[PDB]
Structures are given as structure tokens and as C-alpha cells.
Design a protein around this ligand. Sequence first.
Ligand SMILES: COc1cc(N2CCC(O)CC2)ccc1Nc1cc(Nc2ccccc2S(=O)(=O)C(C)C)c2cc[nH]c2n1
Length: 253
Amino acid sequence: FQSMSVKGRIYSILKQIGSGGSSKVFQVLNEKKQIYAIKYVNLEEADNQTLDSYRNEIAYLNKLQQHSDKIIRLYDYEITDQYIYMVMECGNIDLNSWLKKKKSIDPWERKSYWKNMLEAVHTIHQHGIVHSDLKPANFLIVDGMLKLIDFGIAGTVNYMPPEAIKDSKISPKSDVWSLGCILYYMTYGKTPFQQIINQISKLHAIIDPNHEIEFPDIPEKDLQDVLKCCLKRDPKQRISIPELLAHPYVQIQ
Ligand SMILES: COc1cc(N2CCC(O)CC2)ccc1Nc1cc(Nc2ccccc2S(=O)(=O)C(C)C)c2cc[nH]c2n1
């Protein structure tokens, strides 16, 4: 019921989707009555290291615009010493809400979301970025299509690769492990160590090879292979994003 200006342009605030320290996202309308998400970050108690981290993520989001529509759109931003305003594409729902509120998934819809996850992450990898904290909440469904919102620059432990737990040690392969965990959720309705009540017992489970990960028989033997390949505990043995892109699973239907 109130307004904002970003680079000379006024936006009407429909509602706030999300709050935080010290940042917020509002769903907003421009003068053409087009819809956007505007993130606002308050820098009042933000330190130089923090500030640079933010400037860096903003820089890369802006660059990778050109290179793939599987990264969230940034149309504009206004940045001063007190705040940031980012004028971005508005999502329909984040992947995690979407999976939390889904009772199963269309095999095709899943395959199509995988293609998207791989394309976003493939991109950032091509520019030297390793997200290294990939979750469903890092993805947005926009008009049937999955988009990556964040680059890791600016549950928790479920999607964590074992090389982060033993940690000198982080490679693009760590992202593949984490994607692996997402698909697994989308295939089996849970992450690989979600059974493990206790969070230390989990951490030993994630890194211990005497712990066979289970992969129940399912109609799509390809999906089973992809999962078996991403979730190999040794990154050197694990599969690469560009290999995953040529795999029968994403290539044949
Ligand atoms: C109506 O627009 C939205 C609605 C929702 N939900 C609908 C309500 C609830 O049931 C589940 C989440 C979730 C996301 C959006 N759209 C968003 C959310 C965004 N981020 C966001 C918003 C609120 C809370 C958290 C985030 S997030 O960046 O941390 C991530 C979880 C999307 C962004 C960022 C850029 N564009 C965006 N579009």
C-alpha cells in the first residue's frame, strides 16, 4: 500500500514475500503494471568485507545475465552507502516450497528441472564460480522454468558434499554432489541421509565409505545411474557437469 523508487522509477509494493537481516523482498508493480521482485538490503551495520562480498555477487549476477536464461533476471539496481535495491524477475515459488508441497513429481517435469539446474551451474562454473552450497531454496520456478538466483558469494547439511566436511579442497565437483542430492530428493522424496536423525552421525555417514547409499529400483534406469554417479564420495571418481550434460538421462526420452 506504499511505494519505492529505483533509478528514477517508481514501483508499487503489492506485498513482502520475505524478511531477514538486514534484507527484504517485495513483490512489486511498475508503471506499466509489470511484476517484479525487489530485494532491498540495509547496509547500516554492514562491514567492508561484507560490502565487497555483496558488490561481487551483484557484479556476477549482472554479467551472467547475457550468458543464460537459467540464471534469475536482474533488470536494475540502485546502490548507495545505506542500501541496495535490486530489481529482479519475480518467481512463482522456490523449488523447496514447491517440493515440500508436492506429493510426487512428473518424471518429465523432473527431467526438465534437472536440465535447468545443470545449465545454471554449468554457467557459473564456466566463469570460475563454485557455488558450494546448493539447495532447493537456491532455485526459483519462473514460468515453468527453473532459475538459479544466487552464486554462493554473498535442511543445511543434507546436500553437503563430504569434501566440505573433511575441510585447499573445493572444486566444481562439489556442486555436482549437491545437485545429486536434489535429484535424489526429486526421485525418492528425500535426500540421501535424511533418515539419520542425529547431525553428527549424519556427518560420519556422509564421509564413511562403509556406508552404502541406497538406490531403490525404479523404472528409469538412467536416473538411477545419474544419481549413482553424482553421489560418489571421492570427487575424482564423481561425474562432471559437462559429462552429466551428455548423459542418456538428459539426452533421451
Ligand atoms: C510470489 O513470489 C514468490 C512467492 C514465493 N512463495 C509463495 C508463498 C510460500 O507458500 C512459498 C514461497 C516464493 C518466491 C517468490 N518469488 C521470488 C522470491 C525471491 N526471493 C525470496 C523471496 C522470499 C523469501 C526468500 C527468497 S530467497 O531468495 O531466499 C529463495 C528462497 C527464493 C526472489 C528473488 C528474486 N526474485 C524472487 N522472486
